[PDB]
């Protein structure tokens, strides 16, 4: 409308508000709103950014903030104009506004801008969003504020390529720790998502996360009723146990394994997979830690999963079994063999995925090596797991691989095609 | 020494030149979780490895009436 444009650029606060309110309602109507039609109008987005500065009018500041938030949702191209209009620095000022409504919609706006990409996330961090954002948590705010603030926080910590500079996001760790004591499912879920991102990386980042005290509460949230909390809690836990052996003991001490054994029976397939994945990171542990998994009765369930679950779950359980065989003692491997791990591992050798075959081959290799230890404990010179692998895999297939002439043929065929046709 | 480090690494095969020059056993602890790299395991023996320990919602929201 031309009265929308007139009233917007006019100099009366009544008409300014009235026009802006009609602008919001068009971007609030639910079917993917007309963002570009608004953004293309000359000086209109910059006019909304000018309204954010008007500290003596709560309603107008909120309506403006609501509008720019919704423009900020959607395309990167659309979210570009909001940044270039210079709204980020001003939204961060509004985090210290005297009106709650304004403070809270500023956070949401910035959450959207932080969520657009790696480069927008860092700019927001480089405009010092964090100090005022963490100050929101410093008072008894309403529940919707707390949710919006943690959600924004999680968007600041998010992204792997490249991740945020750790010194800019790690100060939020103290807040995240006490937020795991809140009951609200939305806040718990996003607090966990934030932590899963912060512990995704080298072991110095995991040390900062453990140092904040979060592992016990994380481990406790693996038993929540809502998969919205369990998924991210499980993702954080799984990442922390990609730590050295000290770091992963920190989680075992919180009794994670009985909770992990429970999540292996989950009806939700992605939780099953994530629980295998987590457990495989622990079985990459020391023999002590492999024994704790044995004593929790985890392996019968992993072996069941290894032979009946869908591929992507099967692959994680394979990693779990194989890491156990890389690190474990002869007696621990003997037990895994007695629960029947060789057959499922052999069955993976025929699957058309080179990554799972690598893992399966590595586990069979480790089993066989320890079978040489048992072939000198008993003095026969017979590896006991030779006959078992033969039973599982087939004499045909063993005979094919026993041929050095077959080995020479494949080596040459691979070498030849890769050289003249290129590798792929 | 060597096998105390390599314990935590799955050996994938021999040197694969497209993953860069070979690392030492000491550089190996800085290899990113999930990435692959060549290491000198000894003499002229270069091998491709990865770590056994492996790392892992709505990005934006619109306000409506």
UniProtKB/Swiss-Prot annotation, chain A:
Expressed ubiquitously. One of its GO terms (molecular function) is nuclear localization sequence binding. One of its GO terms (biological process) is regulation of DNA recombination. The keyword Nucleus applies. The keyword Phosphoprotein applies. ARM repeats lie at residues 1-34, 35-78, 79-123, 124-162, 163-207, 208-247, 248-289, 290-329, 330-374, 377-421. One of its GO terms (cellular component) is NLS-dependent protein nuclear import complex. Polyubiquitinated in the presence of RAG1 (in vitro). Residues 162-354 are annotated as: Binding to RAG1. Keywords: Acetylation, Cytoplasm, Host-virus interaction, Nucleus, Phosphoprotein, Protein transport, Repeat, Transport, Ubl conjugation. It is found in: Cytoplasm; Nucleus. Residues 235-323 are annotated as: NLS binding site (minor). It comes from the Eukaryota. Its main location: cytoplasm. Residues 66-158 are annotated as: NLS binding site (major). Heterodimer; with KPNB1. Interacts with ANP32E. Interacts with ZIC3. Interacts with NSMF; the interaction occurs in a calcium-independent manner after synaptic NMDA receptor stimulation and is required for nuclear import of NSMF but is competed by CABP1. Interacts with APEX1. Interacts with RAG1. Interacts with CTNNBL1 (via its N-terminal). Interacts with AICDA (via its NLS). Interacts with SNAI1 (via zinc fingers). Interacts with DCAF8. Interacts with ITSN1 isoform 2. Interacts with TALDO1 isoform 1. Consists of an N-terminal hydrophilic region, a hydrophobic central region composed of 10 repeats, and a short hydrophilic C-terminus. The N-terminal hydrophilic region contains the importin beta binding domain (IBB domain), which is sufficient for binding importin beta and essential for nuclear protein import. The IBB domain is thought to act as an intrasteric autoregulatory sequence by interacting with the internal autoinhibitory NLS. Binding of KPNB1 probably overlaps the internal NLS and contributes to a high affinity for cytoplasmic NLS-containing cargo substrates. After dissociation of the importin/substrate complex in the nucleus the internal autohibitory NLS contributes to a low affinity for nuclear NLS-containing proteins. Functions in nuclear protein import as an adapter protein for nuclear receptor KPNB1. Binds specifically and directly to substrates containing either a simple or bipartite NLS motif. Docking of the importin/substrate complex to the nuclear pore complex (NPC) is mediated by KPNB1 through binding to nucleoporin FxFG repeats and the complex is subsequently translocated through the pore by an energy requiring, Ran-dependent mechanism. Belongs to the importin alpha family. This is Importin subunit alpha-5. The gene is KPNA1. The chain holds residues 84 to 507 of 538 of the full protein.
Curated annotation (Swiss-Prot), chain B:
It is found in: Virion; Host nucleus; Host mitochondrion. A motif (Nuclear localization signal) lies at residues 51-54. It comes from Influenza A virus (strain A/Victoria/3/1975 H3N2). Disulfide bonds: none annotated. The gene is PB2. The chain holds residues 686 to 757 of 759 of the full protein. This is Polymerase basic protein 2. Plays an essential role in transcription initiation and cap-stealing mechanism, in which cellular capped pre-mRNAs are used to generate primers for viral transcription. Recognizes and binds the 7-methylguanosine-containing cap of the target pre-RNA which is subsequently cleaved after 10-13 nucleotides by the viral protein PA. Plays a role in the initiation of the viral genome replication and modulates the activity of the ribonucleoprotein (RNP) complex. Influenza RNA polymerase is composed of three subunits: PB1, PB2 and PA. Interacts (via N-terminus) with PB1 (via C-terminus). Interacts with nucleoprotein NP (via N-terminus). Interacts (via N-terminus) with host MAVS (via N-terminus); this interaction inhibits host innate immune response. It comes from the Viruses. Belongs to the influenza viruses PB2 family.
């Amino acid at each position: 409308t031309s009265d929308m444009i007139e009233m917007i650029f006019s100099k009366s606060p009544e008409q300014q508000l009235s026009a802006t309110q009609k602008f919001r309602k068009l971007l609030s109507k639910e079917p993917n709103p007309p963002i570009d039609e608004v953004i293309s109008t000359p000086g209109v987005v910059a006019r909304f950014v000018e309204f954010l500065k008007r500290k003596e009018n709560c309603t107008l500041q909120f309506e403006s903030a609501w509008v720019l938030t919704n423009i900020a949702s959607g395309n990167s191209l659309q979210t570009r104009i909001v940044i270039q209009a210079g709204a980020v620095p001003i939204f961060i000022e509004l985090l210290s506004s005297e009106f709650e409504d304004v403070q809270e919609q500023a956070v949401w706006a910035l959450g959207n801008i932080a969520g657009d990409s790696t480069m927008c996330r860092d700019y927001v961090l480089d405009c010092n969003i964090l100090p005022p954002l963490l100050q929101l948590f410093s008072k008894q705010n309403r529940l919707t504020m707390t949710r919006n603030a943690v959600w924004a926080l999680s968007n600041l910590c998010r992204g792997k390529s490249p991740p945020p500079e750790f010194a800019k996001v790690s100060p939020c760790l103290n807040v995240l720790s006490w937020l795991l004591f809140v009951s609200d499912t939305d806040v718990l879920a996003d607090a966990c998502w934030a932590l899963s991102y912060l512990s995704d990386g080298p072991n110095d980042k995991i040390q900062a996360v453990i140092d904040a005290g979060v592992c016990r509460r994380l481990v406790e949230l693996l038993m929540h009723n809502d998969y919205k909390v369990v998924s991210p809690a499980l993702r954080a836990v799984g990442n922390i146990v990609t730590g050295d052996d000290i770091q992963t003991q920190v989680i075992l001490n919180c009794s994670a394994l009985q909770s992990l054994l429970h999540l292996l029976s989950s009806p939700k397939e992605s939780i099953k997979k994530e629980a295998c994945w987590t457990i495989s990171n622990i079985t990459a542990g020391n023999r002590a830690q492999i024994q704790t998994v044995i004593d929790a009765n985890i392996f019968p369930a992993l072996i069941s999963i290894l032979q009946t679950a869908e591929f992507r779950t099967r692959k994680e359980a394979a990693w779990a079994i194989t890491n156990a065989t890389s690190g474990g003692s002869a007696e621990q491997i003997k037990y895994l063999v007695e629960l029947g791990c060789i057959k499922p591992l052999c069955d993976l050798l025929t699957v058309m995925d080179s990554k799972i075959v690598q893992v399966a081959l590595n586990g069979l290799e480790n089993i066989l090596r320890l079978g040489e230890q048992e072939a000198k404990r008993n003095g026969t010179g017979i590896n006991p797991y030779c006959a078992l692998i033969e039973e599982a895999y087939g004499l045909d297939k063993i005979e094919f691989l026993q041929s050095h002439e077959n080995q020479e043929i494949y080596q040459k065929a691979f070498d030849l095609i890769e050289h003249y046709f290129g590798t792929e | 020494v060597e096998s105390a480090v390599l314990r935590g690494f799955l050996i994938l095969g021999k040197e694969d030149r497209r993953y860069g020059p070979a690392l030492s056993i000491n550089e190996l602890s800085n290899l990113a979780k999930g990435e692959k790299a060549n290491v000198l395991i000894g003499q002229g023996d270069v091998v491709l490895v990865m770590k056994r320990k492996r790392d892992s919602t709505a990005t934006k929201r619109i306000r409506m009436a």
